Amino acid sequence: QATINIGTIGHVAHGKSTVVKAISGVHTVRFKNELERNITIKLGYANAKIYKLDDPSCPRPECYRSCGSSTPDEFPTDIPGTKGNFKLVRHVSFVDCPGHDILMATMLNGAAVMDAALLLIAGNESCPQPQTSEHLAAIEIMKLKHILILQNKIDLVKESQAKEQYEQILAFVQGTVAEGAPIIPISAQLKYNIEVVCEYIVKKIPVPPRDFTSEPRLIVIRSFDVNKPGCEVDDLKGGVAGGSILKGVLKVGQEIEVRPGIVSKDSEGKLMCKPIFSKIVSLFAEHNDLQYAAPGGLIGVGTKIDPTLCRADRMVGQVLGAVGALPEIFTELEISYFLLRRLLGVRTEGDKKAAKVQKLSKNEVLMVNIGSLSTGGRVSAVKADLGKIVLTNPVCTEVGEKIALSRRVEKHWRLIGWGQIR
Amino acid sequence: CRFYQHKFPEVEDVVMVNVRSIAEMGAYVSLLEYNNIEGMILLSELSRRRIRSINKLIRIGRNECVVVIRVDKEKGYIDLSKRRVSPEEAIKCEDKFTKSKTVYSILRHVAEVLEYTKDEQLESLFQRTAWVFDDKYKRPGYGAYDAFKHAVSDPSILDSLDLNEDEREVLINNINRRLTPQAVKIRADIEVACYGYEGIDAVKEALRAGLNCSTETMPIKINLIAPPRYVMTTTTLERTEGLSVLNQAMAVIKEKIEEKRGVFNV
RNA sequence: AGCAGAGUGGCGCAGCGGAAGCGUGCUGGGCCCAUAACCCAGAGGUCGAUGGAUCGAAACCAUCCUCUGCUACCA
């Protein structure tokens, strides 16, 4: 299954497929083929098995040696050991977030259900690069600090440039946790020092305490239909949710409720929403059958919902509770909030436009990323430490946790501040 | 020979002429509508315009839609015009001619089961097949009977047609080869575009209901080609049988979905 | 992946059991002192593939082949 969710976030032009296939062995993929124009801009999924020969390096199935195929310029070979079967240490899960700035709201959502991260830095561009800081800050807000910085694209980048970049990032982030996070330079054109990464992810990132006894909550981020185009009438199936569970052991045959709900017909107001109920058909993770779905892992829960809800990606950031979950489904919400004194996620060589942003004005639409949900809503009352927001589609608030608040600076939204629900 | 009971055309009868060769005045063409009887086109009237062109890569084996001005049954000369044409429009005549040719081929054998082709005593053969059809009245009526016969299987060997030589061995599997049919296949597209979570269930229920109806009657089959999009494809040989299937399919969509409530487009 | 379209001369592209078309270039010659437009012949044909029912498949039938498109992605 899975034990931890390590995320693979990283700004434009570092190469995703080479690094993702080295760590998991499962390709990051989704629509267009044209696998991506540059680096993956979709929310990729992948799981993997991490075993040892009693060595800090992680074998392949063929554990005698491993000859890469990253480049035919030279032969990159590494040796994990010699063969006689290897001991399974754990089953790991990844969360490949978008690597592009416009997709920030999606990157936030996907990130918010991980248990650790890997900041994929690229040495090609600017030294205190916008997105590195954006990522790091969001991570410390959500409730994580289990980060391993990875210098992913320094294959042709000289050692002065690459040294200056790690220095400037680590010096800018002087108020964000990063001093207890290692910085592992690797090759992505010769897959070198990959074996030492395997030692790091088992060290810096154990399994955090998971609450089995507590009531099941599944947060769905990806939508999958298994009926698909060309289905037969008596080959009928349910609709499958790619979600991570962050609380409770969800068992097979259990009934689960999707709690933001669907709005009642001919509503004259903003209420009323009614949750949808679906019975769990199957609990699939990796490529191995399971009867349980332990928390701390990203699992494909097939449920008895019908094709229309899974025919496109429409279940992004929905909260699912088993069953008749107590969590309130607000339509208008009381945010406590604070703002950054800089504009996060933007800053170029001329140092534009990380200038301090003006105060929020009422009746402006802002993206409130609450939980893994992403709703848009307008601010109806605006006091400094008390704003009232009215949301277009209702938000199930599992706990008052955190929020991330963004404002439409130009073409798309950009992160301005965070806070906590009251 | 020819399918028609009469041996000659009449004034202002639209015919199709095979241009055999160009010589002097114009061309000594053969009317193919009535056997292979000789006629002629130009000298005075045929052209409608002059542009100093009439062929380039238009070779031979071709054919003109013409109308009969003067016909001489005794003398065997038929003065023809193409300039007269307006409701006698060439495309429609050509379409009619092709259909007539296949009908002629059916009526001129007929003939255990080689077929043969040719030749047999000629007046008798034509009289018992094609002349009798023309008699059985009139030309519209013959066309209708012929069409019914053509349809393979509507119903298969029947009408009367008590005729003659034996004659069912030929009717059974010469005629299908002779014609050929082609084909007819028609898609029927249905999109049921629900987006409640009750509506989807309603569509699914409707599809199941549809299957039950299909089994009950015996014909097709609806197939899901995308989550809201459904295709049945209906073949028709009796023509109007596809209408009956379409009506049933529509009714399932309209009544069954309604029960648990949904929306549809068809 | 399932699905709407296509299979023809270089290109455009008629056509359907008793026919490899026509448009455009192509090349020669003519008219004219000569070219041009024009005219004529010349030149360009697995009609995807695999067969079958058949007196005969350019035509019926089934499959395979491809691009053109769809819910927009299918653990």
mmCIF file of C-alpha atoms (C1' of nucleotides) in Angstrom, chain B residues 52-53 55-60 62 98 101-102 105 108 114-115 117 174 177-183 185 187 224-226 229 231, chain C residues 2-5 9 16-19 21-24 38-45 53-57 59-62 70-71:
data_model
loop_
_atom_site.group_PDB
_atom_site.id
_atom_site.type_symbol
_atom_site.label_atom_id
_atom_site.label_comp_id
_atom_site.label_asym_id
_atom_site.label_seq_id
_atom_site.Cartn_x
_atom_site.Cartn_y
_atom_site.Cartn_z
ATOM 1 C CA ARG B 52 -14.903 27.135 -77.851
ATOM 2 C CA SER B 53 -14.502 24.032 -75.686
ATOM 3 C CA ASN B 55 -13.674 18.277 -74.297
ATOM 4 C CA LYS B 56 -10.086 18.091 -73.107
ATOM 5 C CA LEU B 57 -9.633 14.824 -71.203
ATOM 6 C CA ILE B 58 -13.219 13.711 -71.874
ATOM 7 C CA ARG B 59 -12.375 10.587 -73.817
ATOM 8 C CA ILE B 60 -14.851 7.892 -74.865
ATOM 9 C CA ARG B 62 -19.543 8.503 -72.255
ATOM 10 C CA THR B 98 -28.417 3.207 -63.556
ATOM 11 C CA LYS B 101 -29.930 -0.953 -66.005
ATOM 12 C CA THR B 102 -29.759 -3.136 -62.863
ATOM 13 C CA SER B 105 -30.132 -7.140 -65.926
ATOM 14 C CA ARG B 108 -33.226 -10.486 -68.944
ATOM 15 C CA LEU B 114 -25.372 -19.711 -63.929
ATOM 16 C CA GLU B 115 -26.886 -17.136 -65.089
ATOM 17 C CA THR B 117 -26.839 -14.845 -70.814
ATOM 18 C CA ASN B 174 -29.031 -15.084 -58.523
ATOM 19 C CA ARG B 177 -25.523 -11.206 -56.797
ATOM 20 C CA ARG B 178 -27.051 -9.490 -59.842
ATOM 21 C CA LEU B 179 -28.240 -6.259 -58.183
ATOM 22 C CA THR B 180 -25.997 -5.927 -55.753
ATOM 23 C CA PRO B 181 -27.721 -4.309 -52.686
ATOM 24 C CA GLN B 182 -25.710 -1.590 -50.915
ATOM 25 C CA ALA B 183 -26.371 -1.631 -47.925
ATOM 26 C CA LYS B 185 -26.623 1.292 -42.744
ATOM 27 C CA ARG B 187 -26.488 5.438 -37.278
ATOM 28 C CA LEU B 224 -22.219 3.080 -24.838
ATOM 29 C CA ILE B 225 -19.393 4.838 -26.716
ATOM 30 C CA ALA B 226 -18.724 7.518 -24.096
ATOM 31 C CA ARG B 229 -23.213 9.116 -25.529
ATOM 32 C CA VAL B 231 -24.952 4.687 -30.457
ATOM 33 C "C1'" G C 2 -14.111 3.384 -27.975
ATOM 34 C "C1'" C C 3 -16.204 6.881 -31.681
ATOM 35 C "C1'" A C 4 -17.848 10.883 -36.694
ATOM 36 C "C1'" G C 5 -14.821 11.070 -41.911
ATOM 37 C "C1'" G C 9 -3.333 8.724 -61.695
ATOM 38 C "C1'" C C 16 -20.680 1.060 -58.603
ATOM 39 C "C1'" G C 17 -21.951 -6.451 -60.870
ATOM 40 C "C1'" G C 18 -21.420 -6.925 -66.616
ATOM 41 C "C1'" A C 19 -16.694 0.712 -67.536
ATOM 42 C "C1'" G C 21 -13.248 8.828 -64.494
ATOM 43 C "C1'" C C 22 -12.554 13.798 -64.971
ATOM 44 C "C1'" G C 23 -9.987 18.361 -63.454
ATOM 45 C "C1'" U C 24 -5.112 20.397 -63.072
ATOM 46 C "C1'" C C 38 -6.471 27.787 -77.545
ATOM 47 C "C1'" C C 39 -6.832 23.039 -79.756
ATOM 48 C "C1'" C C 40 -5.118 17.904 -80.403
ATOM 49 C "C1'" A C 41 -2.815 13.657 -79.381
ATOM 50 C "C1'" G C 42 1.030 12.267 -76.023
ATOM 51 C "C1'" A C 43 2.193 11.101 -70.351
ATOM 52 C "C1'" G C 44 0.365 9.754 -65.160
ATOM 53 C "C1'" G C 45 -3.903 3.705 -62.436
ATOM 54 C "C1'" A C 53 -20.336 -15.596 -51.158
ATOM 55 C "C1'" U C 54 -19.601 -15.421 -57.121
ATOM 56 C "C1'" C C 55 -20.491 -16.662 -64.133
ATOM 57 C "C1'" G C 56 -17.148 -11.541 -62.380
ATOM 58 C "C1'" A C 57 -15.192 -7.613 -57.000
ATOM 59 C "C1'" A C 59 -19.091 -2.552 -56.606
ATOM 60 C "C1'" C C 60 -21.229 -7.148 -51.495
ATOM 61 C "C1'" C C 61 -19.281 -8.797 -46.990
ATOM 62 C "C1'" A C 62 -16.116 -9.237 -42.683
ATOM 63 C "C1'" C C 70 -14.401 12.511 -29.197
ATOM 64 C "C1'" U C 71 -15.387 12.175 -22.655
#
